[model samples]
Target: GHMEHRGTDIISLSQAATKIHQAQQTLQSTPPISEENNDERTLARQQLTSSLNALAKSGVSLSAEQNENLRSAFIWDMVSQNISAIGDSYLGVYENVVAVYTDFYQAFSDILSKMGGWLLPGKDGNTVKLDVTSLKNDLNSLVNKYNQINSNTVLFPAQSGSGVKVATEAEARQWLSELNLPNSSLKSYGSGYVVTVDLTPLQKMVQDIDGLGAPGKDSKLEMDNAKYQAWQSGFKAQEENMKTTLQTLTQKYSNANSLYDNLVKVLSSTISSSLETAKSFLQ
Candidate 1:
């Protein structure tokens, strides 16, 4: 079934002699890999075997072998060899990714373990209100003491001299200031009750340490859980970006060499068939 002598033979010396010399036209007709694809690299050599073969089967000088050898070279050597390099480049990229993944995991584990015992403060703790009941009780105590002293001027008589004059507003304030009324009523010569305490610098140094203060009462200068949430969000976004980059690289590598095989195959066969027809016209 090899014969295609449809008004011609496979290899005509008379036709080939003139046509093979003009093989450049058909060779140049080899269609390229589509530019719209993900592929980047181009053919290393785009020409046919203008190199002499067979009479010269390179069809070495177009006895007939020249066209066949050019076809052989394109199919066997270029396609076969390039397949391996594509595989190797894919492997190389993944191999580097593995090392990077391991390193990232190591650092990730290291930081998490280090922060295990650390914790953020509870919600807006370190806030306190005026204990109005306790303050009223203390004021009653003071009022009772004063009334007793005033009554002693007429009643069961004086222990200390109560030949006393009426007190002024400033004197009453001064008296309250001198007496012990409460524990944490800030700036209270009168009443500016609740206030934020600025912890000492040394307290900040150990703020996140466990069991430092009455829980639900104070931050003791600790970091707030809201801030922790913000930090978590930022790190999560960064790591996800890393994951996306790895995905892109994976597509770049997988089965990349296969495209090269298709390229040499499609283009070479096209060139060879067309070249034979071209030689006929030349003769």
Candidate 2:
């Protein structure tokens, strides 16, 4: 099936997911449109409508009990929307935090170079060609100590169970509560809920984040072990703040992530199965 038989499951399932994701984006734009301002809504619905029609042509639509899980397009849409709806939910923390760490390391290394330290190799008349390899190794431990908060935006439990499960209100509630974010709160949304957190805490943490305090903030920048120590001391507090927030943000929502990813895998398999089954019948 992975090899592609062409004009069958390969093309249609690809089109189904592609079209739904595309349509889902447009559906997300408005707040339940009415007759007058529904141009975007109309297009979005039509996109899915056409996608479903084509899928049905190949004998795979939500209406089929045999492929019941195909209905998950709606659920996955919600999962995607939930991530998009909130800020500082730990979803984008991986990318943003990584950037902050890189900046801090570069700045700290520059300070070391100025202090006659060999963190950045030499500019030199003698040529410090091989020093960088050693320098990087020594410096690596400085920042690598920090946690990555799960490199995956949304992979939870780290293993597969019974496929994807939708997030329950309680699960979502507990996840948000674990953040202990005084600035954030979980609120009602019809039958479901979304946790709204002040993204500023995490966002600022990412921007000002580092293994040590940001460069040139508290100290006068004379460049020495003492200054570096002081800088690291200052940032240790910030790092703790970052550590707590990110750890909570990623770990707390594992159930939800687990559920969503499992559903995604199931839906993928369902489509593949349906396609192969149809192909068998056709041939």
Candidate 3:
């Protein structure tokens, strides 16, 4: 028995016509990725670099070979630790994006479930009423999540030096490009590929969802069937595209993690080997 890999079901007017509303509920708040504990991450790099430099100036009486070995050991250790911390923070970026999508899907599903029977005939005296207030709030909360990356920026530890740098969209693309994913579908979203966690799609989604308009006063408002159905068909099409993006970003996250793991491992071994060589000379 073979199953199609993709699970897409086009919403039909008949299927949509026989549904009703559920009470409104709030969605998960998007977690902040911008600058939270940023100082702490920056501090680690500062301390490591400071310590490395101090060790270099330490007036330990030793031969040139011994001193060089000692300094090499320190550099490897500091770079390794710094890159390792960056790797952890890189995953943090992924987690934040995941949370945004998680809330996005839930809120969209909420709208679909609550706004059913939107295709009911207007000739019938009954009109479908729904409270879109929670839906609005749910969609609005995602603004900060997008702002966290777009306006504020996510900080990544610098390859060399005590300072950390903000991630740019270009740099994000550069990162994925380096991964060499098969056919590079993993690198793309919309027109180009995904990098530095593009929340633009998610942001556009919030705006479009609101474009359907909320009630003017109380949470509950009656809707015109034609308007509801038109909005429903169009908005519903977006879920699959966004869903595909989510999966691609997830694969991107894992590849970065693996690359970082390999880098840190090699750096860690050099740290050990350098120290051991210095020890051999001392003995």
Candidate 4:
């Protein structure tokens, strides 16, 4: 007499394949985080806990209907294995990218805090009491932190072939195709899929920062029209620009991570539903 909410809507093998394709594309958008061992554990804890809470809210439904959508266990095995490989590789990259962004965010906040006090309206003609050296130092630090790239090691340091590298769409499709074979093996092809971090803005930022004149020759505090020009046009202008740059990059990576995040849940939900259906037949 009863039915409905107890079962999951069936999805096609093609639908699953399409989802995998999308996930890989999302993965290809960002570089992996550096392996400096800075705050990775804390980030990992936060990421895991948040994901756990979200998964709890969604409820891991354990019901799947056996329909034409999923044709056979054999094919599902391949699809699920592919999903596993994709998720395993991409999730770590997402975590590392988020970490670097977090560090960059903090660096910007520090620079902004120091620069905020120098923006007072009446201080233009007076001896500028604030030391510009500190601000410049912070800015330089940010430039290095954001600009550093390790091609030889990071994600897969031990292997000669591994590390942060590019994975093309063609290769991604090939991974999918190769995995479909009966004799295909599971491996670390996922490592090559991580893309380059866009550091163009950071490079430009350095140029603009350099144009802001030397960070003062002496520690003496003096306010003049020349100093004011450097303050307003040089440092302040780039501050505003970098603020936008930071926000844009953060939003970009976070959105990609969120999308890449869906693969795990989707696969789990579908598999759980199918699992529930399988149990019912046994009973």
lDDT of all predictions: 0.33, 0.42, 0.43, 0.45
Per-candidate TM equals 0.28, 0.33, 0.38, 0.46
Name the best candidate (by lDDT): 4
- Give the candidate number with the greatest TM-score: 4
Give the Cα error of residue 237 in candidate 3, in Å.
3.1
TM-score for predicted model 3 compared with the true structure: 0.38
**Using lDDT as the measure, what is the rank order of every candidate, best first?**
4, 3, 2, 1
Q: For residues 46-82, what per-residue lDDT tens digits would candidate 4 score against the true structure?
A: 4433433443343233323533333332134444455
| Pick by lDDT: 2 or 4, better one | 4
For candidate 1, write residues 1-283 as lDDT tens digits: 4544433333433343344334323323432222211111222222222221211332312225544654554433443344445423332223333333334334434433544333433446742222223322333333333223232211111012444323344543332242211222122222222111111211222232222333334322334556445544654564454445434433433333344444434434444554566356633
How many backbone clashes does every candidate have?
19, 3, 2, 3
Q: CA lDDT of 243 in candidate 4?
A: 59
Stretches off by above 4 angstroms in model 3 are 1-126, 149-173, 176-197, 209-221, 257-283
Q: Candidate 2, 76: how far from true, in Å?
A: 12
Q: What lDDT, from 0 to 1, does candidate 2 have?
A: 0.42
Ranking by TM-score: 4, 3, 2, 1
- Better candidate by lDDT, 3 or 4: 4
The true-versus-predicted C-alpha distance at residue 243 of model 2, in Å, is 2.2
Q: Candidate 2: where is the Cα deviation over 4 Å?
A: 1-11, 17-65, 70-179, 183-238, 252-258
